[model samples]
Target: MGPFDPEEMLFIFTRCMEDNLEDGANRLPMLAKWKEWINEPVDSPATQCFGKCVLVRTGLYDPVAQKFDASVIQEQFKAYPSLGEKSKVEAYANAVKQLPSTNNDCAAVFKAYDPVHKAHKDTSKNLFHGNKELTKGLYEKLGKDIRQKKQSYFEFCENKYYPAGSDKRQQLCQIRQYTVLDDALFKEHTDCVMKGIRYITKDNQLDVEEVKRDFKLVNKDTKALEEVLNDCKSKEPSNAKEKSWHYYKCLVESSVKDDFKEAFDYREVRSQIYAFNLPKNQAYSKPAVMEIDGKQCP
Candidate 1:
């Protein structure tokens, strides 16, 4: 080729800078080693070329004064006709807009890298590998139910739906009628709720605050369901009478409600970091969101 095109050169420059900032793996000392190797012929020609390219292409290698300017990179990108294409220019614009000032400070360099990285997050599917389809399905369906029920219960309790001095045992049993989960559904439900938390927290479209709140509630309900399940498991009650007694006790246990509340609070605080880490605009794709309980994924 006669000369590297603008897109080609910019891509090379950006990728090199990104790799370097990855862990300060090639901050000046490593570059200095490359500088030493360049004279000894110990390094491959490609490695030598890369070193030279960095010296010419990056502010990190500026001899007069080490400085990094995102605008300068943008200007270089503008010079290329290949990036004249609107889509390519837009992508480059966004990438450069978030560029971190790598001006000889590794801490700032790493901090600056986060925005662009978040912007480029893979949203097409779950970041973690697992039964994502099942997770999504449960989230969109039964997950929705659990959240709605929790809210209603919170309101009911707050509103004093039960008469004053009403039998506390009856109250717990009444809530259990709607909230209890069989063993198989309980496992699937919790798994999906946790994974759903992962999904929304990672998604750029959802509001950070709302996602945290919603998932926090889901965690609370899941925990409550867990306690209810444990009560059954612990007693292994063989008859309806024993089952009813243990079930009521589990619900009334002072810790059960507190655990659910704290679980909600815990998930809220826990997921906040994820929201901050998420990118501003990202594109994600997935197969048709599956339905398991007459609920369709949106």
Candidate 2:
């Protein structure tokens, strides 16, 4: 199949991003910061396979052959119309041919695509800009900020605690919800966020004033903030992890009324609180010899 036109490429990329965003799979580091691929920071680490997803969605990457389609390569030659382009396409062709046993690798696919994508910087620039505008609006509605401060805390904490292969990394959003309380790593993740945001001090003090500043919590009713903080402070737990989780849940459940929720578009934290009620005190009747083992759990 031929490569998608630049405009269609933008749609494909946007759709992949929104799809990821919707699934709550990639929330940190500004969700899918695909535009930052130009500078090539480790923050937008190549391992995410975002480009691979885009190329796969474009129907240009032949996953089975471990190469882009020849037709797509031919079509892409015309994508960049300037002089010196023929040589660039030939270079791209050579680069793709030389990438051995890539097995649909993100880095390999990028190595194949970047040359031509750069050659077509004419639209590359617009693609990045259009992607920014589209995603910024999407994130804004979801309460995520794309730039500097929106993720200063999470960017590093996630990198520090959840480097590529960590099992804990997969549970970041769940930890955000305080759902997995038993895992020490998950507990530490919560505390890490508290510490990262400077909500708690280096000495592990829950400095409400510091947290207030961090969240920019100047509310119409200052008393509500005070009440929430004071109440959370009142019920402080022993451990930093539980303390932070308790305090976080306090913020969600208290009559503070969505101030913090709206500010960060802090959806995950809100889910554990607002969705369904906790289970009741009634004891379950025994299913004992009822052949419950035959139940095929999903």
Candidate 3:
């Protein structure tokens, strides 16, 4: 009948995120909520639409390896076909065939290099998979920090897109621009997570209740998270895109405490490490502090 409202659009996006997180598919109501009045409607970015984005903010990952899986390395080269002997070829082929199928199986690898969403920052960005560029903790920490940056971006969008005082720019700030998260981008991310959950769960069962519980827990601050659109109301258009990234970071922080701490620590560490090493991974583990501890360490 009419164009969907921003709040309604966000609700649909959130619902899709929830379904994907819990049931692996959006229910009919969510689609109905997002029905378009014209050619098509837009959706939020992948970084802004899901509970896992919040989970990444928490920095809770398995630590079998620090960066990525060695299997990834072997697999990449597997297609190359080793010039070695039959035994070596079999071993190499087997290795390639054995590449971890689940993100959880290769948790460190994915956690190190893949933040699940390209829109957010994660330790994975700092290091090449299997290169040992960063430690497991550092990788988790990096993902956490990037989540902050993403939050800041969302904050930017919030200010610009949610304009206050009846500004004309508000007309330009449609929610449909977030199509990536709403449609294609997060679809892939959501699918991977759902498929992998079969492996990720300890009991070989889809923990729908756990997904629901975690979603609620992580999204307890929806009011605050949704506030990013409000925050967007004040930012200048030129920097609005980057600022929206910040809002995403904030969203992430609200859901996961470990990721928030990791992000804060990473920045603190980055500033110090940047002075010694240009590369973030080569720099420091924790943020540089003004005051250390009872011993007065800096």
Q: If scored against the real structure, what TM-score would every candidate get? A: 0.21, 0.34, 0.18
- Candidate 1 lDDT by residue in tens digits, 1-298: 1123322233344334333321233344444443222221223333334433443444423323443334443453444333234454456446745454355433344344334424632220111111234334533554323332123322223123333345432433433223444344233333333333432222212223432333344443444455555554565455432333334334435356554434433443433332221222112222231321233323
Give the per-residue Cα lDDT of candidate 3 at 216.
39
What are the runs in model 2 whose C-alpha is more than 4 Å off? 1-151, 173-182, 214-220, 264-298
Q: CA shift at 216, candidate 3, in angstroms?
A: 5.4
Model 1 lowest lDDT segment of ten: 122-131
In the order shown, what is each candidate's alpha-carbon RMSD? 21.0, 19.6, 21.5
Order by TM-score, highest first: 2, 1, 3
Highest-TM-score candidate: 2
Q: Write the per-residue lDDT of candidate 2 for residues 1-298, one digit (tens) a residue.
A: 3433333444455445543332234343434344444423323433236667766765557788776653544455565343224665556555555545456776677666666555654343332333455434434553422212133455445556665456545555554443445555555666766654446655677767654532442233445777788878878887755776666667767786466654333322222222111121122222222111243222
lDDT against the true structure, each candidate: 0.36, 0.50, 0.30
- Per residue, candidate 3 scores C-alpha lDDT tens digits across 1-298 of 1122222223233333443322224333333432211101113232222322322222222233322233432332343222123454345334424434334333233333332323222211122121222334433555422222213332323333333444423332332122124333333332333222211132223333432333333333334323443453344235322333333333343444344334432333322221222111132334344111122222
* Superior by lDDT: candidate 1 or candidate 2: 2
